[PDB]
Design a protein around this ligand. Structure first.
Ligand SMILES: [Fe+3]
Ligand SMILES: [Fe+3]
Ligand SMILES: [Zn+2]
Length: 286
């Protein structure tokens, strides 16, 4: 029931916490036989112009997107926002605020970690690959610790020092899921709850009631085909999707080398991508 062919609509680049350029994403997605790809960087549209250029030169269809961190009660929620107006003032202000809060938080973490680990702010910035256009975050601390030889992989770092459980962890303030959904729809976009079945990060998943309230706010779909969603959660989420007539998406959550996730390991079917395009803004020329 996971699509054998289609689009990988959940991919990160150097403009957030992936290791590759938008050109590299488009190039590779084409070579892997994908029907298309989405850019889905954290709290930004910075890679959209590079992604679009690459899509036209390489000839691979492209969905323009963003992964937005949100919160709902105690639950941390990630939302994929596709095909919205990137000059929408409200959504740009919100990304700006989120980015600023996450920068302050990351510097406070590095300052704490620096007391115990061979890590400096410059070491973190050496991991930020697009300068002021990169959404800086936890993965850049993890990479700095890998580069300093504290951990083998970024995964190891998240299991320990950079972990939500550790004494160095500071949480980032995030807008509510209701604020994000209203903002994305306002900007003419399509909003999907990303990996809502994934019990890493959270002590608990979103409930049916939280999801119902997100559907009433304007939620368009659920990412079902994702490695973090176990089988029982995929059936739960497919049931909710069928019931409320929601879109069902999939994606690799590729971060290039920064994660084990493989480009195209999970996909959205062509017909669902059709629906995303038709609901979203016509961005041809912008
Ligand atoms: Fe996520
Ligand atoms: Fe992601
Ligand atoms: Zn990420």
């Amino acid at each position: 029931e996971p699509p054998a062919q289609g689009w990988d609509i959940h991919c990160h680049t150097v403009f957030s916490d992936g290791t590759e350029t938008p050109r590299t994403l488009v190039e590779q997605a084409r070579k892997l036989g994908l029907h298309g790809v989405a850019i889905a960087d954290h709290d930004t549209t910075a890679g959209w112009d590079e992604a679009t250029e690459a899509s036209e030169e390489i000839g691979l269809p492209l969905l323009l997107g963003t992964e937005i961190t949100a919160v709902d009660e105690d639950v941390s929620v990630h939302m994929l926002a596709f095909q919205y107006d990137p000059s929408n003032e409200h959504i740009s202000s919100m990304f700006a605020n989120t980015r600023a809060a996450r920068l302050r938080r990351t510097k406070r973490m590095v300052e704490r970690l620096s007391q115990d680990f061979p890590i400096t702010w410059d070491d973190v910035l050496a991991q930020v690959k697009e300068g002021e256009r990169t959404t800086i975050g936890r993965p850049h601390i993890a990479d700095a610790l890998v580069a300093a030889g504290v951990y083998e992989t970024r995964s190891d770092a998240f299991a320990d020092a950079v972990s939500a459980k550790s004494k160095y962890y500071i949480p980032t303030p995030s807008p509510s899921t209701h604020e994000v959904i209203a903002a994305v729809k306002g900007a003419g976009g399509v909003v999907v709850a990303a990996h809502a079945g994934d019990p890493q990060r959270n002590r608990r998943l979103l409930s049916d009631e939280q999801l119902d309230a997100m559907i009433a706010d304007g939620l368009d779909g659920l990412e079902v085909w994702h490695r973090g969603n176990p089988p029982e959660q995929r059936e739960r989420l497919l049931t909710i999707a069928a019931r409320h007539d929601l879109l069902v998406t999939g994606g690799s959550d590729w971060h290039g080398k920064g994660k084990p996730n493989g480009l195209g390991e999970n996909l959205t079917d062509d017909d669902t991508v059709r629906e995303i395009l038709c609901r979203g803004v016509d961005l041809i020329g912008r």
